[PDB]
Design a binder for this molecule. Structure first.
Ligand SMILES: Nc1nc2c(ncn2[C@@H]2O[C@H](COP(=O)(O)OP(=O)(O)O)[C@@H](O)[C@H]2O)c(=O)[nH]1
Length: 330
């Protein structure tokens, strides 16, 4: 019957690709809200050290698949270089690459109170969990979602504690989940408060990898009009659509693609099938090895948050799907 090429482009257009209308409006609803928060921050909280919150995520750069239902709103903290320093996780006793301790420097000389964020310090370290709670409470305590919603003809209601998430119904039957992501930038190190999976690492900030990864990907496709992004979206759609693959993330799949791009120059449209197969094969062998290095930061293993058992099950699921092509593609 059909070639894999056709099946994939077909799968992409009927499953991976968000319908044209829905993505514009979802994205626009997010844009509309982000702006209204810009003015709220000027008026209500000129005291809290922040910069303007801005959108980020797959929906914002057209990498979101199946449904336009989520996006991040970054909350950039202001931290003074003099007062704070970030510590690579591999240099901590935790020994976890891709994560940082954010340390409060010399309290004898910089007493508590020198930074607003000193209230979020636990044992000399800026706690990511506590920053989230404080922000959530300081926002919850000054914000008027019913009014912002009325102003934009959206209904906006926070969610149950996931208190850092907003549910935006922007049409009768459409909604969008915006979650707030507190971020810190020290030097050229960008960190986000997206907690490590295990509880014992909850004092660590996460190295933000998404911007460089997606910029890299976009630059490569731009250069040669390649299908790197198209292949990623298909994979994302499969993992999202297949429960057994729920542990796979956009970040891992993107790096699978980027590693492959180091070794395949030809990403013309007709090579899509071949690259997709290579990517599947790559992912499987990364899983077997128990290690998927970040293309942009080799020291970081993007499977390090997964247990060996989960890695093993992911590997098995994928092998099995090789002989169930029609379950993999819907
Ligand atoms: N926007 C953003 N999300 C990040 C970052 N680091 C980790 N994440 C997480 O990774 C996910 C973002 O996924 P995304 O790239 O948008 O692809 P998708 O959610 O699978 O469509 C969310 O769960 C984020 O919390 C980051 O630096 N920026």
């Amino acid at each position: 019957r059909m070639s894999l090429q056709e099946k994939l482009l077909t799968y992409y257009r009927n499953r991976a690709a968000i319908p044209a209308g829905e993505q514009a409006r979802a994205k626009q609803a997010a844009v509309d809200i982000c702006a209204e928060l810009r003015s709220f921050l000027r008026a209500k909280l000129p005291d809290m050290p922040l910069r303007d919150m801005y959108l980020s995520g797959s929906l914002y750069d057209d990498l979101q698949v199946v449904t336009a239902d989520h996006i991040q709103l970054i909350v950039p903290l202001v931290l003074e270089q003099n007062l704070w320093s970030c510590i690579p996780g591999e240099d901590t006793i935790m020994n976890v690459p891709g994560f940082f301790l954010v340390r409060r420097e010399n309290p004898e000389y910089f007493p508590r109170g020198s930074s607003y964020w000193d209230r979020c310090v636990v044992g000399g370290y800026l706690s990511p969990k506590t920053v989230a709670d404080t922000f959530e409470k300081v926002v919850a305590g000054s914000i008027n979602w019913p009014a912002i919603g009325s102003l934009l003809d959206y209904v906006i209601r926070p969610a149950p504690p996931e208190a850092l998430t907003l549910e935006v119904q922007y049409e009768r039957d459409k909604h969008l989940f915006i979650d707030f992501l507190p971020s810190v930038t020290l030097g050229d190190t960008v960190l986000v408060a997206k907690p490590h999976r295990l509880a014992q690492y909850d004092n660590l900030w996460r190295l933000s990898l998404r911007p460089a990864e997606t910029a890299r990907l976009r630059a490569l496709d731009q250069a040669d009009s390649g299908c790197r992004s198209l292949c990623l979206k298909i994979l994302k759609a499969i993992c999202k659509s297949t429960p057994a693959l729920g542990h796979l993330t956009a970040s891992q799949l993107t790096n699978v693609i980027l590693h492959l791009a180091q070794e395949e120059a030809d990403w013309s449209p007709d090579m899509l099938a071949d690259r997709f197969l290579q990517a599947l094969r790559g992912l499987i062998s990364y899983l077997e090895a128990g290690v998927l290095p970040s293309a942009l930061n080799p020291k970081v293993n993007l499977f390090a948050e997964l247990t060996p058992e989960e890695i093993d099950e992911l590997g098995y699921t994928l092998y099995c799907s090789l002989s169930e092509p029609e379950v993999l593609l819907q």
